[PDB]
Structure formats: C-alpha cells, structure tokens
Subunit: 117 residues, 4 copies
Amino acid sequence: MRDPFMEALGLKVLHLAPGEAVVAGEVRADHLNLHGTAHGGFLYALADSAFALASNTRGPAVALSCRMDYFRPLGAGARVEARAVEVNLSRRTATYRVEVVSEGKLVALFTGTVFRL
Amino acid sequence: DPFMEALGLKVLHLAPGEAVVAGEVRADHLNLHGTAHGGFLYALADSAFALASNTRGPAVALSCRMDYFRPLGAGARVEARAVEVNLSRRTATYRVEVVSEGKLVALFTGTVFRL
Amino acid sequence: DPFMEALGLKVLHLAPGEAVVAGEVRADHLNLHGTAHGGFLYALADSAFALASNTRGPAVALSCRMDYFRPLGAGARVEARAVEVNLSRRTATYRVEVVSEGKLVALFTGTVFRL
Amino acid sequence: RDPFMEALGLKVLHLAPGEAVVAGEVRADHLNLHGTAHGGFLYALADSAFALASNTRGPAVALSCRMDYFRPLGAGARVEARAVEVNLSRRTATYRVEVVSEGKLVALFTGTVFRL
Ligand SMILES: CC(C)(COP(=O)(O)OP(=O)(O)OC[C@H]1O[C@@H](n2cnc3c(N)ncnc32)[C@H](O)[C@@H]1OP(=O)(O)O)[C@@H](O)C(=O)NCCC(=O)NCCS
Ligand SMILES: CC(C)(COP(=O)(O)OP(=O)(O)OC[C@H]1O[C@@H](n2cnc3c(N)ncnc32)[C@H](O)[C@@H]1OP(=O)(O)O)[C@@H](O)C(=O)NCCC(=O)NCCS
Ligand SMILES: [Cl-]
C-alpha cells in the first residue's frame, strides 16, 4: 500500500511481517531545522510510519496516542532505521514500540497505540 | 526552517512563549489510508512547539505526545497553536492544539530541555 | 473507590465530563527523597480522570501521560482538576491539572476507550 | 526506604546499576469502583521501579512518564515491574518499565528523569 508522505520524505519499507515493520530513510537537507539537525517531525514521521505499517498488518487501524522520546541529534547524511514491534494486541487497540536507530545508536524511542477500526 | 518550508508550513504568530503555525494538507501529506499522515500533523504541531520554546532561549525536545481525534483529507486547512504550560530554569512544557475549521484535530504535549 | 479512600482522597466536584479530586500529602505518601511520591500525585490525577470519564458511561483507560513540574512536601494540599478535551463515540481524552497552593505541580493527559 | 511503596505493600526484589525489580500483590485497598486494580496502583508500582533504577545513577527526578494499560487485574493478583535503562545522558535518562503478572504484560511504562 503506497504512502505518499513516506515517499515524500524518502522513507522506504524494508520489511513487513505480522505485527512488525522496518522502515529506512536518510536525513536530507530538507529535513533539517534551523539548527542544522534533523527536525523532530522527521524522526517522528519515520517511527510513526513503521508503526502504521506494523499495526495495519492486523487489519484497519489509525494512530490514537503516540509518544516520542528524543535521545540523540542527527545531521544530514545520517542513515536511519525504525523497527516497530508489537507489545500488545487487543480487539480494539494495539500498542507498538518503535526504536529509531542510526549507526547502531538509539536515536529515539517511539511508543504508539492504534485504534482498530 | 528547511523542513517547515518543505512541508509548506507558515508561521502566523510568534510572541513570548507562544507560536501559531499554519499549513494545508496536500496530496503528498496523505498516508496509506488517504488521510492526513499522523507524521504530518505531528510535524506541524512540533514546529509551533519548537518556535514557542525557542522564544525563551535555546532548547532541545525531550519527550512529546500526540493524541489524534479527527482525520483530515487533502485540502484541509490546519493550524497548530502553541502555549506555554510550564517554564523552569532547565525545562519547559507546551501544549499545542491542532485545529481545522473550528474542530480539535489533535492534541500535542511537549517538554524541552533548556540549554 | 477503595484506592481513593485508602489515599484519603475526596471528590470536590463532579459534572458531565469533569471532576475535581482533592487530597493532602501525608507522611505515607512520600518517596525516598522526602517529597510527594510521583505515584501519589498520579493516583490523584488518575482518579479525577476516572471519575470525569465515567460520567459519560463505562470506560477503560488506555494511555496516560504525567508531566511533573514542581515537588511537594508533607502537608501540601493538592487538587486534580480534570476537564474533557475530546469526546467521540468510542474514545474520550482528558486534561488533568494537578495544583497545590496556586502552583501547577503536574499536568496529566489521558485517553479512555468508551465501552 | 520509600513510605509510599511500603504503604502499598510493594517490595524491592532487586536493585542494580540502572535497573530495578519491584513486586507486590493487588489488595482490596488497591481496587477501583469496578473491582479491578486501580490505574494509580499499577502506575505507582511502575513508577517505583523507575525511581529506584534511575536513582542508582545519582539523584534524579521524574519529568515525563507514560502509562499504557493492557490487561485488568483482580484482587490477589501477583504483579512485578522491571525497570530497564533505555538511554543514559549527562542531564537525562529514560527507562522502560514492564508491568507483568503471571508472564503476561499488564502495562507498559516509559519514563524520563532529569539528573541533578
Ligand atoms: C480513533 C477514532 C477512530 C475514534 O473514533 P470513533 O469514536 O470510533 O468514532 P466517531 O464516529 O465518534 O468519530 C470521531 C470523530 O472523527 C470523525 N471521523 C471518523 N471517521 C471519519 C471518516 N472516515 N471520515 C470523516 N470523518 C471521520 C467523526 O465525524 C468525529 O468528528 P466530529 O465529532 O467532528 O463529528 C477517531 O478519534 C479518529 O478518527 N481519530 C483520528 C485518527 C487519525 O487521523 N490518526 C492519524 C492518521 S492514521
Ligand atoms: C526537573 C526539575 C528539578 C528542574 O528544575 P530546574 O528547572 O532545574 O530549576 P528550578 O529552580 O526552576 O526549579 C525550582 C523548583 O524545584 C525545587 N527543587 C530544586 N532542587 C530540589 C531538591 N533537591 N529537592 C526537592 N526540590 C527541589 C524548588 O524548591 C522548586 O520547587 P517548589 O516551587 O515546589 O518550591 C523541576 O522541574 C522539578 O522539581 N520537577 C519536579 C519533579 C518531581 O517532583 N517529580 C516527581 C517525584 S520524583
Ligand atoms: Cl506520552
């Protein structure tokens, strides 16, 4: 299933399986904030995308509540990967942990819950 | 801001501890469902959050939360309104309401570390 | 509510989509540092959250966030004021401000699934 | 010693650098009006492991915490929370706290502290 925003940000789906997904991307010049580092919205979009894909392997679902914890700043050129794993699957909701990693370092931690339509 | 420009976001208001940013959901901002991508709405809220916090001095985001209430389609005009909830020497927290045509689309809560 | 009674919490106000719960930090509500335990302040906010959301019918908490701004000592009078920020057919979200002697001690944000 | 932890009957099973395990049992005084463990009790348990694990690195105070609830628990249920360090910076640290009962994840807690 094509995701226009993911493609606009240059994010690619690497792997998809029941309740899990791995999305990859690279911080580009157009993803930076005024300080020369990756904008918080880009790293979130990346993690949120892995989250969207992993959650929808279970059926139609939409983002309900998500948390993003930032640990390390990134500059242009940095290769990034977001790996989503299912921590809970219920009939009406599901929760996923998404780790954002760059060169073996945990850049950010995303926690999200979807509402299963 | 490169990312803001790429997403077509515009700063409408900036004052001590507050900021308002606006944008429009374009075809390239939709997700796999054909609705406004959660990452786009977050980027909008995060932008106002960043601007508002920076009026107090340099700061880095630590933890942010986004709660989604209503979906939006292409063409929807959206706005993020950031207000300061707490300001301390080393941290600050802001509430950012994402609204479209009088409806609360999403609620963002973010905390920064003040440098 | 057994836990509210155990913590000595009192309901000061209850209306559709809102509630105010009050309590005092006792000696058995402190953490290892001698200040109000984060779990006590959360329990207070969570209780107002639970009461406010149940005014709309049966519901179960899904996700809650607690942001701490100021510490409190034994004897502090505290209040959790919950207000509905969003209501849908199957969900509801509340903002709960935890205050003591005119200061915003913490901010709670929670969402429930409406049964 | 933590007064609130003791009031709730919580016990420290293990404490090590950046880690902690706290256990307890849901008692009659921990229930909500619906007869299940109050959300404040489960959070208090997670928060306690979080506080202990974080303070092994030096004095620290909670900034922001998230609690996701998955399964309700009744009185008598044995529960434990394990706090693991996910990130350690000079000024802050973040921990993942899994709340479990009989091998099942009852809730997930995520917390960040400010290191004094
Ligand atoms: C989570 C969610 C599905 C829960 O909704 P619900 O309780 O099951 O059902 P409701 O019918 O009460 O819908 C709630 C609101 O969303 C709207 N909505 C829901 N589905 C819609 C759709 N397919 N098209 C247009 N509007 C829709 C409702 O009209 C209502 O807005 P309103 O109060 O202004 O009328 C809903 O809050 C929602 O859509 N949240 C946004 C999710 C989102 O866009 N996430 C990011 C992208 S994945
Ligand atoms: C994280 C925190 C320390 C950052 O503070 P800061 O920006 O570096 O500095 P500030 O001078 O602006 O903060 C002053 C407040 O913190 C207090 N404080 C500072 N050092 C303290 C300490 N060692 N022990 C107890 N309180 C302390 C002040 O007394 C004042 O609190 P008050 O208004 O209730 O009297 C602050 O936001 C805070 O105290 N948060 C509360 C965390 C909390 O209580 N969490 C739950 C229990 S662990
Ligand atoms: Cl959160």
